[PDB]
C-alpha cells in the first residue's frame, strides 16, 4: 500500500526560518516605507498574510517593484507589530496601541486580525 507522514510542526519551523532570514536580511526583496521608517521583508510572506500586499504584488505593473510606500497616516509602530505577527504568529497588544494596530490591520486588509482587535475592545 501507500503511506504518508504529516509533520505537524513543519509550518511553524518554516515560519521561524523565514523570520531568521528576515532578521539577517537574506533574500528580502522589498522595502516597506512607513513615513520615516523602513521595513525589509519577503513579498511572499506579505502576500500570504495581507490583502493589500496580495493585491499589490498580484498586479503586473507592480509585481517587480522593490519599494512600497504606505499611506503617510499609517504609524510605524503599528506596522511593525503586524509585520512581527506575520513572521511569528504572535500579535502583541497593549491598551495604548490597539486602535493603532486595528487601524493598521484595516489598512493592510487583515480582517481576521481586525476582528480579533474588535473582540479585545469588547472585553475592555
Minimum CB separation of residue 72 from another protein in Å reads 25
Q: Which is nearer to another protein, 16 or 35 (CB)?
A: 16
Place of cell 487601524: 103
Are 68 and 32 spatial neighbours (Cβ–Cβ below 8 Å)? Answer: yes
* CA max distance for the chain: 59
Site for a second copy in 54-113 (CB under 8 A): 57-58, 63, 85-86, 89-95
Smallest distance from the beta carbon of 72 to a second copy, in angstroms? 27
Q: Which of 48, 62, 111, 115 binds a second copy (CB under 8 A)?
A: 48
Contact (CB, 8 A) for 45 and 32: no
Amino acid at each position: 500500500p501507500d503511506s504518508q507522514i504529516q509533520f505537524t510542526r513543519h509550518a511553524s519551523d518554516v515560519l521561524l526560518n523565514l523570520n531568521r532570514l528576515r532578521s539577517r536580511d537574506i533574500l528580502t526583496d522589498v522595502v516597506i516605507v512607513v513615513s520615516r521608517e523602513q521595513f525589509r521583508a519577503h513579498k511572499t510572506v506579505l502576500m500570504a498574510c495581507s490583502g493589500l500586499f496580495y493585491s499589490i504584488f498580484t498586479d503586473q505593473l507592480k509585481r517587480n517593484l522593490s519599494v512600497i510606500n504606505l499611506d503617510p497616516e499609517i504609524n510605524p509602530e503599528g506596522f511593525n507589530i503586524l509585520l512581527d505577527f506575520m513572521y511569528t504568529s504572535r500579535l502583541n497588544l497593549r491598551e495604548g496601541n490597539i486602535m493603532a494596530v486595528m487601524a493598521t490591520a484595516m489598512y493592510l486588509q487583515m480582517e481576521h486580525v481586525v476582528d480579533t482587535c474588535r473582540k479585545f475592545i469588547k472585553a475592555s
